Every structure is written in structure tokens, then in C-alpha cells.
Design a protein around this ligand. Structure first.
Ligand code: MET
Length: 521
């Protein structure tokens, strides 16, 4: 089916300021989005804030301001951060939004009508900071900010409290079999695989019913009322997970403000998400609860959930570090340095290593070589002569790259996609050192044409597939290479030889550097 490619970040709690956790999650969302736009598809990327809850109100209480003021402000801080980071997210959703609340009421009522919601009790442990229900096996001893003998979550380490409330309960136990079918039938639906195996083991152990309402007093009334029972409020997580459904039904205008909420999700061709980007901290909510709610309501399940190494909830300010090293450079580092186990190194020493070693020396260097007036004497893409077997060996790599990178982007594994491109860049540099085109201006012009054309085309294709990672620098590179706008996106232009010979380069700046190297501290 030809739909809108729907990619989402998680919606972040507004109890605190934007930090790297959120910037990272939304960066992954943004890159996936951009890739599918470069591929020439329709894209809706969603991000936003998660504004109801005991945890938010109790943080608004701390600053001694009303919940409406505190959330609006922090939401603003989030919006500004994402504009500074230079994402291309299509909409910013807020759970305080009135359209969103309508959708939550719709969904709640649908679940009630199915007989999947009932009035019961929850008597157990709860982490206010995680907004998570925990069994006694998931808790152990620890300390509070006041350093007293309290209990804490094994998951997160935040403080837990015992809760004994009469709650509206969701019949999650009844969705154990159908969830297991979904996992085993769609083995790519949770990524990476070891997290898929985690979710499956957990559901096989057994599922308790899930409390989906709280008594309004406990939430400091900062929540959505349960339809037809204002004594209770809706669990922040059913509220929160529903943002994806809300998002898929909002018409948005030129400026990014929402204007209309359609009745039927099919009208906009967005639901369900093709990728949900999340941190490992919130895997169970997205891989167990969410599909069960959607199963209950007769809605379609998402295609992929990708859970990364960081935690979604010693200073490291992204906006500071981007101002010091470059914006695209930082994004490159975060996407290249870590896969899906979180153990990677985020020191300056390392970023500089990757900035100099890879962005400057591999990519940047190569861009300057194939454009410089010394080597490229006519300032154009020359017409190639006949190809050696060494020429063919490089061309073959260039031709294979798009398919390879495409499979990686689709997993999705953005680290592996980058690596695949840089493998081809390293190869092109090797070909250039070997060919030595700087010598060939004097001795052999017929040959230089061939060498230079291949270089240029390798640089174009590598740059095209890197454009979701380095969106600004890719534009600068293409300008230098003189690539017409039409050839900068679309699967058509993944093919070798898309730009014809005789294409003129962009004008040069006598002092232009693509990536400037920085000192080993
Ligand atoms: C439905 S995504 C909710 C995520 C949660 N608000 C967090 O910040 O981790």
C-alpha cells in the first residue's frame, strides 16, 4: 500500500528541561523521516510533550506555579530546542491539547464498549517518576534525597510508593495470546532483536490486568477525566500513548499549528506508525500495552518499534556542543558513535577524533580534491574514457551502496547505514591516492577525465545517502559539485551516472572549508 510514512518520537515529560535524551530520540525520528523524504515518499514525523501526571504537577508545585503555566513554559523550551537543533519534524503535539483529549475519550469509550475496561482495585507498587506499575520482584532497597531507608525501582532507581486505589482496570491478561501471535508473525516488528526477545519472554511469563485510571485527588487533578466518571482521571500512559493516534488525525497548516481533527484516521493515510522511536526505558508500554489497546479497539498495529540505548528521562548540552563543533557534525557523532547497546564514548576527545578522522579527512578532503582548480581544471564534470578493472571495482561499490544503505535505513540501523557509506568513501580516497589525479593533469588528461568523473559521482551518491545525517553540509557539498536540485532527491538519483557530464560546478569561496579540523586538546 502507498501511505504516508509515519515516524514518531516519544512524547517527553515536561517536569524538566530538554536534555540530550530527548534531542537524541527526536534526532533518530528526524533522520528516518528525512531519509524517506529523500527517497521521495510522503512523510509525517511526530514529536511532542507529555504534560499530564502526578509527576508533572508535583514538579509544577515545586516551582510554585500553576500546572497550566509550568507545562506551557516547558513545552516552549522543548519547541525552541528542536528548532535550534534544526530538525524537520512535521508536528509538535501536546497532551493538554483539546483535540488530543477528544481522541483519548473516543479511545477510552471504545475500550469500555468492548468489555475490556472494568472497575477494580490496584494494590501494589508504583514509581511516580516512571509513571509505571511494578510487581514486588522489580523493587529493592535504596535511598531518598533525604537519604532514608526507602524502596526503589530495579528498572530506574527512582523512589517507589505503595498504592491502594479502586481503579478502572484494562483486561491486559486477555491479550497475551494475541500479542504473542503478533510478535512471532512479524519478527522485524521490535528492533533490535535482543529487545524483541526480552518483550516476548515477558509476555510468555503472563500478563496482569493494567490499571488505567487513578483517583483524581492522587493526580492533583492534572489529568483527563474518565468519560462518565469525573471522580477518576485517565492513566497518563493511555493518555500519552494515544498521542500517536491523535497525531495521525490532525490536519496541519503552513506554520505547523493544528487546524482540524478528522473523524477517521484513514482520511490522512498515516495510522499506524511505520516506526515508533523510543528509549529502552519505555519498551513495555510501546510493545505490550499499546498493541493491546489497539487490538481491543480494532485498530491496526504499528509496523516497527525501535528502542535505543540511551534513557529518555557532568553536563552535556547539545546546543552548546553544536555551537562549538557544528550542528551536522554533532548529529553525525551521536548517530555514528552508538548503536543499540548504549556503551559508546561521548568525550570531546572522541568527537574531535571523528570530526577530523572521518568528516574532515575522509569526506571533506575528498570533496575538495574533486572540485579544486588544480585537478578539476575546467570546473565541470568531465566525460569519462574507458574504464579499467580498478575503475569498475570502485563503480561497483558505488552502485551497490544505495541498496545496502536502504536496507540499513529500513531496519532501522542508522549507525550501520553511515558506516556503509563511509566504507565507500574510504574506498574512493584509496582510488584517488592510487590514481594520483594531481599528476595526471600534466601527464595524461584522457585518463584524468575517467578518474575525476568516478570520484565526483562517488561523492554525489555518498553525499545523497548521507543527506539525512548531514542535511546542511550535504546542500553545501551539492552546491560545490553543481548538482541540480532535481538530482538531490528521489530513488531515480540513487543510480550511478544520474548527473550528466558537462554539468558545471558551483563557484568557489577563496577560504571555504567544509569541515575545519580541531586541535587534540
Ligand atoms: C508515549 S511516549 C511517553 C514517554 C514519557 N512521557 C517519557 O518522557 O519518557
Amino acid at each position: 500500500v502507498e501511505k504516508v510514512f509515519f515516524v514518531t518520537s516519544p512524547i517527553y515529560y515536561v517536569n524538566a528541561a530538554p536534555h540530550i535524551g530527548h534531542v537524541y530520540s527526536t534526532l533518530i525520528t528526524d533522520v528516518i523521516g528525512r531519509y524517506h523524504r529523500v527517497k521521495g515518499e510522503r512523510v509525517f514525523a511526530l514529536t511532542g510533550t507529555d504534560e499530564h501526571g502526578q509527576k508533572v504537577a508535583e514538579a509544577a508545585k515545586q516551582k510554585q506555579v500553576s500546572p497550566y503555566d509550568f507545562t506551557t513554559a516547558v513545552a516552549g523550551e522543548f519547541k525552541k530546542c528542536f528548532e535550534q537543533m534544526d530538525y524537520s519534524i512535521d508536528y509538535f503535539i501536546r497532551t493538554t491539547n483539546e483535540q488530543h483529549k477528544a481522541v483519548v475519550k473516543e479511545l477510552w469509550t471504545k475500550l469500555e464498549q468492548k468489555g475490556d475496561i472494568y472497575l477494580g482495585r490496584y494494590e501494589g507498587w508504583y514509581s511516580i517518576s516512571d509513571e509505571s506499575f511494578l510487581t514486588p520482584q522489580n523493587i529493592t532497597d535504596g535511598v531518598d534525597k533525604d537519604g532514608n531507608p526507602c524502596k526503589v525501582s530495579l528498572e530506574s532507581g527512582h523512589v517507589v510508593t505503595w498504592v491502594s486505589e479502586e481503579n478502572y482496570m484494562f483486561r491486559l491478561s486477555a491479550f497475551r495470546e494475541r500479542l504473542l501471535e503478533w510478535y512471532h508473525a512479524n519478527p522485524g516488528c521490535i528492533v533490535p532483536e535482543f529487545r524483541r526477545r526480552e518483550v516476548i519472554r515477558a509476555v510468555e511469563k503472563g500478563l496482569p490486568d493494567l490499571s488505567v485510571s487513578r483517583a483524581r485527588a492522587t493526580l492533583h487533578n492534572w489529568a483527563i477525566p474518565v468519560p462518565g466518571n469525573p471522580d477518576h482521571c485517565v492513566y497518563v500512559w493511555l493518555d500519552a500513548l494515544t498521542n500517536y493516534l491523535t497525531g495521525s488525525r490532525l490536519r496541519v497548516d503552513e506554520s505547523g499549528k493544528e487546524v482540524s481533527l478528522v473523524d477517521d484516521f484513514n482520511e490522512l493515510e498515516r495510522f499506524p506508525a511505520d516506526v515508533h522511536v523510543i528509549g529502552k526505558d519505555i519498551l513495555k508500554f510501546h510493545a505490550i500495552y499499546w498493541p493491546a489497546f489497539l487490538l481491543s479497539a480494532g485498530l491496526p498495529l504499528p509496523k516497527k518499534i525501535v528502542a535505543h540505548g540511551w534513557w529518555t528521562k557532568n553536563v552535556f548540552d547539545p546546543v552548546e556542543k553544536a555551537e562549538e563543533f557544528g550542528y551536522d557534525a554533532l548529529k553525525y557523532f551521536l548517530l555514528r558513535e552508538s548503536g543499540f547497546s548504549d556503551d559508546g564514548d561521548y568525550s570531546d576527545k572522541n568527537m574531535i577524533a571523528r570530526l577530523n578522522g572521518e568528516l574532515a579527512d575522509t569526506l571533506g578532503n575528498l570533496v575538495m580534491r574533486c572540485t579544486s582548480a588544480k585537478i578539476n581544471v575546467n570546473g565541470e564534470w568531465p566525460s569519462p574514457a574507458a574504464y579499467t578493472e580498478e575503475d569498475e571495482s570502485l563503480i561497483q561499490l558505488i552502485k551497490d551502496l544505495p541498496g545496502t544503505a536502504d536496507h540499513y535505513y529500513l531496519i532501522p540501523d542508522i549507525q550501520k547505514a553511515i558506516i556503509a557509506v563511509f566504507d565507500v568513501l574510504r574506498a574512493i580516497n584509496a582510488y584517488v591516492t592510487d590514481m594520483a589525479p594531481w599528476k595526471l593533469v600534466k601527464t595524461d588528461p584522457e585518463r584524468l577525465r575517467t578518474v575525476l568523473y568516478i570520484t565526483l559521482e562517488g561523492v554525489r551518491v555518498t553525499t545523497l545517502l548521507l543527506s539525512p545525517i548531514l542535511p546542511r553540509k550535504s546542500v553545501v557539498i551539492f552546491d560545490m559539485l553543481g548538482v541540480p536540485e532535481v538530482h538531490r532527491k528521489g530513488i531515480e538519483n540513487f543510480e550511478f551516472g544520474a548527473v550528466p557530464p558537462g554539468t558545471r560546478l558551483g563557484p568557489a569561496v577563496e577560504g571555504e572549508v567544509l569541515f575545519s579540523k580541531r586541535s587534540t586538546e
